[PDB]
Design an enzyme around this catalytic site. Structure first.
Site, PDB file in Angstrom:
ATOM      1  N   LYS A 200     -52.203 -44.194-121.701  1.00 39.26           N
ATOM      2  CA  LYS A 200     -53.635 -44.106-121.736  1.00 39.26           C
ATOM      3  C   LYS A 200     -54.033 -43.935-123.179  1.00 39.26           C
ATOM      4  O   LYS A 200     -53.269 -43.383-123.955  1.00 39.26           O
ATOM      5  CB  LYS A 200     -54.137 -42.926-120.902  1.00 39.26           C
ATOM      6  CG  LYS A 200     -55.587 -43.016-120.466  1.00 39.26           C
ATOM      7  CD  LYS A 200     -55.785 -43.882-119.294  1.00 39.26           C
ATOM      8  CE  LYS A 200     -57.258 -43.994-119.013  1.00 39.26           C
ATOM      9  NZ  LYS A 200     -57.458 -44.598-117.684  1.00 39.26           N
TER      10      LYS A 200
ATOM     11  N   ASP B 109     -61.549 -49.240-119.221  1.00 41.64           N
ATOM     12  CA  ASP B 109     -61.843 -47.982-118.571  1.00 41.64           C
ATOM     13  C   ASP B 109     -63.270 -47.653-118.937  1.00 41.64           C
ATOM     14  O   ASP B 109     -63.932 -48.463-119.535  1.00 41.64           O
ATOM     15  CB  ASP B 109     -60.870 -46.877-119.000  1.00 41.64           C
ATOM     16  CG  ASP B 109     -60.776 -45.752-117.982  1.00 41.64           C
ATOM     17  OD1 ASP B 109     -60.147 -45.988-116.947  1.00 41.64           O
ATOM     18  OD2 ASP B 109     -61.226 -44.617-118.251  1.00 41.64           O
TER      19      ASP B 109
END
Lengths: 442, 442, 442, 442
Positions: free
Chosen positions: B123, B163
């Protein structure tokens, strides 16, 4: 203003004649679309598009059979990587220069984009003259060239191929030297031999592809090759395997031709007949006239096939071989569809006459793209680490031709019939352009 | 001892609140499995699993439209590569910090592992605030970020995605700069556009997958979407295509929502109504409120859908949108299943209430995994250098969701109902753990 | 506004206590300089300076002598490359965290800049506790650390060194694994042994330089080491050669110390005596008490040297070893100069008290820079592929210290005494800042 | 002249016995083919073919459980990359040397060519002895080896695998260290566990493949496994799944064996019986003798299965386990076919004797190629980033064995029976030779 944009682009390359025309032709074809779609003119897109990302010019020093040291110039034009790695052939010929190479790479970018496969556009070559050179001289030359060039290529960077002066032999030499120097066996050339990653169906690809695209075109307008009379012009690679594939779809193929003349066979080609024709023209002296003598068939000494009444005509011989007059005859005799196997066979006016007469028309830039599609399938096979059976390659080729056809239809208008000329011109530009826009100022 | 383990892990990160909660929730779910399976406790495995392989924190300097120089912080948490390359999105939001990114990457590791595709966990992001930024500013920022980040990524190393704060637009800009800087066209970002390697079904993937998964879950417990009342929150791509697929299975989908409020349609969505919702939410100002006016539907101004009595609730808007008060209403009104389309919609307390009430509950890590699974299918298509038809992608997404469901059932216990929270965590862990064990002390 | 900048800076790292202090301290000294030189505030230079270019946090897994698998965290903070590659030591200590390492890298950036050598700033380490570890455990730990770290280092990228918890032994292990993995023998570490690229004068460097610096400071203000009573704290590397050089400049050095207590020698160290202390201290367990017993000298069991009346105090043991109460004694007994061999030995309050009493004060940030300066000379010799004689390393080390001293004086004000705290911060800052401005927004 | 050529080859390696024997055996089988085809003699192809492209010999230093430092030797022989990357196992055994590794890698080159998959040839190992070593010692050894070896490997360069002394455990350790050091997750080892890239059917592959091939061979000559008596030697991997597949094809399998002796079961193996044999042999202490005791079967203490009358004999234990006397017994008892599961179980004289008696004989070089073929399928799944179902792997394996059978038949002569020795050797040589020729003098 078209002339003003063209005049501006030329300022940087006042003497690149071929490249100048290539830019004019593309822009002339696109201008009305660009007028109606200002989106594809923003962000200085047209100015970005005509400037190649990268050009490498380099010295090639090699030794000939008399121990004389020779100096050549070589290039790799890496034009666009918007859609995928630079893809395009290498050309060895004494006339090659940057202008010719930029013209080919520029065009390749749209041609590759049109296939729907993830390939950018590039082109390369050398003023090296292969004529009269021994196997050894050509080998040494290829190796000296790769000693510089290897550093600029890669399976995800630039994958070259053959072209004029660069056949299967030279690809082999260049691929071998790429592998040695990089110690890496990934696919960096297409057109490889079957023993080291090449693909089956490459000889059949353009002809097969021509028939696939044309059948899709026929299915969409409620017709098909099944039971149709088909004329083919030409008798090389493309014409041969076109004939083969139309026969598999139930077409009765009734002509083939070379420069000297045309063979006519109303009972139609068979597998055996085509086999002997392929054999005959694989010699350097073989003539359609000989194929006709051998099978007791009608021969039309220097005439074209367009006088015969057919449902479908497939010109697969050369540029401008199907003119206004032939188009009038084909129309009057009830032709339903025309698809181009060769490079720009139908004249612009003949194209227009077919369209206004409601004759389905497939431009070569789309219908003959099977050759280029199979260089993509070779990459795909190498990437998969599995060679495919001929049937599998062929099946996958068919689906690609259906995808190209779908792309032409998407941009082919709302008329009662799809305009595939318009469709094929627009689809290639749009895909490259969309990609450039998504990827920012780079 | 769980508490002792949790206490030990926190010592290195005394202030990473979100990350601590994440390690706590997972370990709590795993602890009984570990008691019954000492194999997965050996070789300091838990201590290895909670420590991310690599984190890059870095400075990003960029210039805004007023010619002022801005400084931001960015990260890439490369958590686990046991199973495959680091995989996970990038987040642009002013609240982003190391704690949050470790928590999300940690979560990503188990989610990716569960999909059965060969993807690790990662991430990244920045405290850059995209709100109010012009397109050029977002572009300059993305590029300045890639100027550092490009060296740590790779198609077989780390493949990011979008995202919050990072959509198709931003993915394009990062992918483009990655391509430029590396001179390499391989797949290093997913969520790309169709023009440069994206996959069909990617927009539908999460929503579709959610319904495929939930249907499997229902059928296993003697139910199905057919005839059920379904509330959906949200009105972006997840919610849209959840609504689409649920209608196709015979569900009566009766709500949709955005931040401003919720539309209620007791007769249920149709193809036409959903089409129109999508058009409206495709504009920048379109609101569910406008959609309700056009069809004359009940609008619940700044309310959620959860007061409505339904058989199935599908939260597809945002994190923490389904808390204890809502859960009480849903349970009291007889809800049978809850499945998460969004990322962590349900709070820990609300989740527990659903399970203890004998409500089927599907955590997003399993049920919304169609998106990330389909991002693996994107990678796969790029590797093959051949795109798939929507149907081939849909069929594979479906089959993957059934495999995910099957794994959760295998480890979800023997009760009257499967515990999918327990099931998804244990199934994900075992695959990561088996891989970490085989690959040695590294 | 200073408070406003410090408050803004802290938002990203609300809990990095050590790092906030370092930034506060630097910024407080610069703020008046910056007001007078608005150039150095432009282009968000300060916001850029306090944000490290790159930080890598990583997992280190290793096996201890009982075959238990241990997990530790490591870092390399690559703070600034404006002037040259990231340069700074590695620290193994259980208290190590990002905050502390950022505090150390930030200082290193300015200290390296002050040397006039082309070195950036960095710092690294691990929370690994070397205490009680066997040679084998430390070796395995070092190798596991290097298995990750090697990829981020390089002779022109990042060149680490030793620090607390990392001596010649650990540098050797890390340098060895760097060479194996990279298959490259270039200088990627300083503090190497003489047998594989180390430099003469390295053990002596920090102590020598301290005396070199302090002597310039003294001379400027009408004094010198000759005939002075000098107290030294500590008894490792820095103290030993501080003592050596001070005797060489004619001082009577009357103390040395360890954690356990202080040896007092009113007649002063001699070459003979110092040689034997070095032998005793060459073990890790060796004690001053044993050194005092052998020459029949006073041992002040657990006391520091600061109660002793001296002209010059040289703290060379650890951080915060000289507080106000000690300073009060030193001032009352007539101290003229204090210069720091260790890193931050004098507390802020003890410092302010020295300045207010007209005691010459040379902060470690300038005065202990000989070590790192000589690590630059090690790099220089390795790059040249030729080692220097001791006299040559020493002569150049000396010149450097005189340049550092000169730089501090230029910016230390016009007062009755040079403010070296102020001078060293500004001089250090100006060099890094000029480089950042010239090299653009990166 | 064969003898003059063998002698020329030997000049470089006068003491590599195994290698000399391997080159002799291949060349003796090819010599008549080469006489009839001067093409395959051109360009010093044979001298080139027997000299490996690259061999790396290296020091491996590791620490044993007593903290003693051990020194071993390791190798990677990278023999041929004509067709694809170097492919072949690693062998840990105290007898391993360059001669042995060259012999295996040379052979590997042809077996790999035969699969039709794009694989070169290689082999590696160490004289490291795994016997009596702890898991930790073996892990540390594997890691120390990869510390050097990782730099010579790559998913498109050299992809090793297991062998004697290197099972799943060791592949895992080496792969893991490869991944760690390169920060790259691509397939560089085959034989991986299912949790990190392994393939289904890998355990079954050599045994399955053996039966698939033999079945083609029986059918081509009017026979099949159905209703046949089959003897199997061995009880490891190869023998278990040979038995499994032969039972599935309708065979009566009546033997299995280990080093200690042979079990005879006239009623034939069953699924349950084989399951128990596997369990017993899955232990470290298991013996075929215990299996015989358990099912009340005839045990022939230390005898081989060859005295027993069968239709088909399948040697799957070790090299040279079937010599002339055994061949005489098999012939006298009416054997129809012999196929090799192990590597060269049958001696040259026994081979010739079978061929002269009209017994179908399948050499291991073809018939046991399922294992390495399936390692190619493992590479292939990894390249695709998608695992296949067992059924798809098996189907693809089967078709590959059938392709191998077809190539052997093409070059196996016109007699009453195919000569598979001649066929598998020529077919392998032709693919490699074609590739070497196309790629030039490199």
């Amino acid at each position: 203003s078209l002339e003003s944009f063209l005049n501006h682009v030329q300022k940087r390359d006042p003497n690149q004649t071929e490249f100048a025309q290539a830019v004019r032709e593309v822009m002339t074809t696109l201008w009305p679309f660009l007028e109606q779609n200002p989106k594809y003119r923003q962000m200085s897109l047209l100015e970005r598009l005509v400037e190649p990302e990268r050009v490498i010019q380099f010295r090639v020093v090699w030794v000939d059979d008399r121990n004389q040291i020779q100096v050549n110039r070589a290039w790799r034009v890496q034009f666009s990587s918007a859609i995928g790695p630079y893809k395009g052939g290498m050309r060895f010929h004494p006339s090659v220069n940057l202008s010719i190479l930029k013209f080919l790479g520029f065009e390749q970018t749209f041609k590759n984009a049109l296939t729907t496969l993830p390939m950018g556009g590039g082109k390369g070559g050398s003023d090296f003259d292969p004529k009269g050179k021994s196997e050894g001289e050509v080998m040494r030359f290829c190796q000296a060239l790769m000693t510089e060039l290897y550093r600029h290529l890669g399976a995800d960077t630039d994958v070259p191929a053959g072209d004029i002066g660069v056949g299967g032999r030279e690809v082999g030499f260049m691929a071998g030297m790429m592998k040695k120097l990089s110690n890496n066996t990934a696919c960096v050339f297409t057109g490889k031999g079957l023993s080291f990653g090449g693909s089956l169906i490459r000889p059949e690809a353009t002809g097969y592809g021509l028939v696939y695209f044309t059948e899709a075109m026929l299915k969409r307008h409620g017709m098909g090759f099944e039971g149709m009379r088909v004329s083919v012009s030409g008798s090389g690679n493309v014409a041969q395997y076109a004939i083969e594939k139309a026969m598999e779809f139930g077409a009765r193929v009734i002509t083939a031709s070379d420069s000297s003349g045309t063979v006519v066979d109303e009972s139609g080609f068979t597998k055996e007949k085509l086999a002997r024709l392929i054999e005959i023209k694989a010699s350097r002296d073989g003539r359609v006239a000989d194929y006709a003598k051998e099978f007791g068939l009608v021969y039309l000494e220097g005439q074209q096939p367009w006088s015969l009444p057919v449902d479908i005509a497939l010109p697969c011989a050369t540029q401008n071989e199907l003119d206004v007059d032939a188009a009038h005859q084909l129309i009057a005799n009830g032709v339903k569809a025309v698809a181009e196997g060769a490079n720009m066979p139908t004249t612009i006016e003949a194209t227009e006459l077919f369209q206004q007469a409601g004759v389905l028309f497939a431009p070569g830039k789309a219908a003959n793209a099977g050759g280029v599609a199979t260089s993509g399938l070779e990459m795909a096979q190498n990437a998969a680490r599995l060679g495919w059976k001929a049937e599998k390659v062929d099946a996958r080729l068919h689906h690609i031709m259906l995808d190209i056809h779908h792309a032409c239809v998407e941009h082919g208008g709302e008329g009662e019939q799809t305009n595939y000329v318009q469709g094929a011109n627009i689809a290639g530009f749009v895909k490259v352009a969309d990609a450039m826009l998504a990827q920012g100022v780079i």
